[PDB]
């Protein structure tokens, strides 16, 4: 009857596999949850700069995106996308940094297109704290600030945020880690 | 002050921790 | 010795069952957690209006309650209760909407009875955004704003919030989903 | 402005997602 | 071939064990997560005062520490430590209460040493609400407000917060539970 | 107003719920 024993064993094994995926998926979920921000500001910590940058060049991982952050408990859902080895006109020469609108559970109640002012910036871990950054007001005609249809809209930002040379030779990187900060203006919003 | 569309090159990866 | 093999198999199976419940229970927990609000405002999204409304009529599910929301990190715990097919004087003719005080971990420190002003409202997904709503100040003698003893107090609200006709014929429902919003005044609270 | 008690009819269900 | 059956059974059992730890660890994680505060204020609820106090005397558990709380979504990580039977000059006679700086994910961006004003206090569940508390401004030379290296710095506070007599004979304890509250000033922080 | 260092006696335990 080992067939029966074996069948049962087989079933259990499949279950344990599912369980392992279920579990891992939750570790991820916890992580995202543990780093959520609802005031429209994001502080994204990227560890392993060297290794990651290399994965960029090689092309194993051209970009990285942050956990999601919000303008409020029930507001716009957004995240950041970075390219360690550059994108577009800055590929191979710059670090590209973009803003991303994601499909939020409450999009139906939020104003569109997205018109909140976004401020992209790379923090200087140096004692002078001369953080690099740039702000812009969404272009009302860009399909990037359109009411989401897919999980996330087309990212918008600066392909040439910083020269890779400037970066690596400045005091922005420290302990093989960098910090990206995004600031979305929420004042504009009347009383969402 | 004008957003510049990014190339959805792919090879993306969620990284936060 | 298949008895032994079988005994072990039996034990493992029971465990896997527990694990599945444990897991599901967490998905739920994540959901609630992922939608918590601590500024005293709740935005409750109800999907599948048609199917759900029918379950109301039939009586499989007379009402639905929101995930909990708070007046602050350590303040009052509350939630909303809705009746798609109506309750009380509005049963079968209206959508009833009520406010609910739940037993909070910090009730011992909070003032009682609950006297914060509550504003119930159904959002208009229409372009005009003429949301339906109603406010009221808790009746200090109602056992609904009494210091909780059970998981949740007796709900209070408007049995006749909106006529089912008005509702279904307006632009409040969109994509078989509606949005209920509750607003609890937190200013009153000195510095909880 | 006065809350009206609801009938704890039952058949309740947590729905958020 | 029972060896094979047994081997498989053995493997599965080990897995189920891991799974149980994984699960429990998450219950904990949920708990912490479910009680996080980001406005620099902590309300710590300690249940089972009697039993716990006894574990203190006996020395099974000399102290207890709160879940972590923050000055902001990406600010300082802190927690509280209490000694039910007292520490230092107050051991056996007082309840000692201390503040603790923990290693935060964003320490690299935060100012050091920690100079935010901290207010320790034990809440009075009594009708008069005459809460006991004390404030102080971090001593810039204390290794307790230094940029963390280990999981948590050396705690600082008042070994003689309250006489055990005063405590137990006052209306601070209620239903075998007490509430500790900590208040870290966040105004000082320019715009972290 | 001056923090007083605590004795890391040990026998600690996380307690919140």
Residue A7 exposed, middle or buried by CB count within 10 Å (0-12, 13-18, 19+):
exposed
Contact list, A1 vs chain C (CB under 8 Å)? 2
Which of E146, E150, E163, E27 has the alpha carbon at shortest distance from E89? E163
Strand partners, A58: none
Chain A with chain E: Cβ pairs closer than 8 A: 47
Q: Do B14 and A144 touch (CB under 8 A)?
A: no
C-beta of residue C123 within 8 angstroms of C-beta of residue C179 = yes
**Are A33 and C34 spatial neighbours (Cβ–Cβ below 8 Å)?**
yes
Distance from CA of E159 to the nearest CA of A (A): 33
Report DSSP state, residue C38.
-
**For E126, phi and psi rounded to 5 degrees?**
-75, 160
What is the DSSP pairing of strand C118-122 with strand C77-83?
A: unpaired
> Please, which residues bridge with residue A174 across strands?
A177
Q: Between D6, D10, D17, which is nearest C159 by CB?
A: D6
Render the burial of E36-55: b for 16+ CB within 10 Å, e for the rest. Answer: ebbebbbbbbbeebeebbeb
Contact B5 A135 (CB under 8 A): no
User: Which chains have at least 3 CB atom pairs separated by less than 8 Å from chain E?
Assistant: A, C, F
Contact with chain D for residue C133, Cβ under 8 A:
no
DSSP assignment, residue E156? E
Nearest to D9 among C62, C67, C144 (CB): C62
CA distance B17 to A180: 13
**Residues of D whose CB is below 8 A from C45:** 16-17
Residues facing C100 on adjacent strands: C79
Chain C residues in contact with A16 by the CB 8 A cut-off are: 16
Q: Are E68 and E42 in contact (CB under 8 A)?
A: no
Task: Give the CB-side neighbour count of residue E24, counting CA atoms within 13 A.
Answer: 6
- Give the C-alpha separation, C47 to C175, whole Å: 8
Among C45, C138, C156, beta carbon nearest to D6: C156
Which helix (H) or strand (E) segment holds residue E167: the answer is helix E164-169
Handedness of CA A187, A189, B2, B5 (dihedral sign): positive
CB E69 within 8 A of CB E36: yes
Contact partners, residue A71, CB within 8 Å, separation at least 6: A38, A39, A40, A78, A116, A184, A186, A189, A192
Which residue from F minimizes the CA distance to E58?
F11
The number of folded domains in chain A is: 1
Question: Under a CB-based contact definition with an 8 Å cutoff, are residues E165 and F17 in contact?
Answer: no
Q: Do B10 and A62 touch (CB under 8 A)?
A: yes
- Give dist(CA A110, CA A113) in Å, integer: 9
**Breaks in chain E at C–N > 2.5 Å: after which residues?**
none
Is the CB of residue A83 less than 8 Å away from at least one CB of chain B? Answer: yes
CA atoms lying within 13 Å on the CB side of residue E137: 4
- Method used to determine the 3D structure: X-ray
E139 touches chain F (CB under 8 A): yes
User: How many angstroms separate the Cα of C165 from the Cα of each of C46, C158, C183, E90?
Assistant: 18, 16, 25, 70
Nearest to E45 among F5, F9, F16 (CB): F16
State the nearest Cα–Cα gap between D9 and chain C, in angstroms. Answer: 7
CA geometry: angle at E153 spanning E187 and E123, to 5°?
55
* CATH code of the domain containing C162: 2.60.210.10
Distance CA C157, CA C134 (A): 9
Q: Strand pairing of A132-136 and C64-65?
A: unpaired
- Neighboring chain E residues of C29 at a CB cutoff of 8 Å: 30
* Listed residue (E175, E184, E173) closest to E95, CA to CA: E173
Q: How far is CA E176 from CA C55, E20, E67, in A?
A: 44, 31, 20
Residue C192: name the closest of C41, C67, C38 by CA: C38
The DSSP 8-state label assigned to residue A72 in this structure reads S
| Residue E113: cis peptide before it, omega within 30 degrees of 0 | yes
Least CB–CB distance from B11: residue in A59, A139, A145: A59
Inter-residue contact C68 to C78 (CB < 8 Å): yes
Provide the pairing of β-strand E156-163 with C118-122.
unpaired
A162 and A95 in contact (C-beta within 8 Å)?
yes
Residue of D3, D6, D14 whose CA lies nearest to C96:
D6
Domain span holding position E75: 1-192
What residue spans of A35-77 are helical by DSSP H?
Answer: 49-58
Which of A49, A64, A145 is most worth mutating to test chain B (most B CB atoms within 10 A of its CB)? A64
Determine the 3-state secondary structure of A180 from DSSP. Answer: strand
Q: Is A161 on the interface with B (CB under 8 A)?
A: no
What DSSP line would sit under D1-17, residue for residue? ---EE--------B---
């Amino acid at each position: 009857n080992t067939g029966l024993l074996e069948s049962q064993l087989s079933r259990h094994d499949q279950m344990l596999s599912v369980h392992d995926i279920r579990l891992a998926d939750m570790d991820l979920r916890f992580q995202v949850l543990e780093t959520a921000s609802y005031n429209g500001v994001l502080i994204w910590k990227i560890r392993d700069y060297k290794r990651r940058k290399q994965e960029a060049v090689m092309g194993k991982t051209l970009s990285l995106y942050s956990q999601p952050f919000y303008t409020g408990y029930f507001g716009y859902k957004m995240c950041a996308r970075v390219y360690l080895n550059g994108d577009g006109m800055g590929k191979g020469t710059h670090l590209s940094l973009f803003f991303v609108i994601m499909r939020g559970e409450y999009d139906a109640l939020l104003p569109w297109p997205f018109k909140q002012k976004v401020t992209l910036m790379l923090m200087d871990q140096g004692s002078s704290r001369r953080h690099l950054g740039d702000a812009f007001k969404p272009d009302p005609n860009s399909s990037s600030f359109k009411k989401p249809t897919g999980e996330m809209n087309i990212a918008s930002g600066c392909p040439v945020f910083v020269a890779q040379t400037v970066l690596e030779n400045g005091t922005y990187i420290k302990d093989d880690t960098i910090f990206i900060k995004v600031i979305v203006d929420t004042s504009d919003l009347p009383d969402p | 002050s004008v957003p510049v569309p990014a190339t959805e090159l792919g090879s993306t990866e969620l990284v936060t921790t």
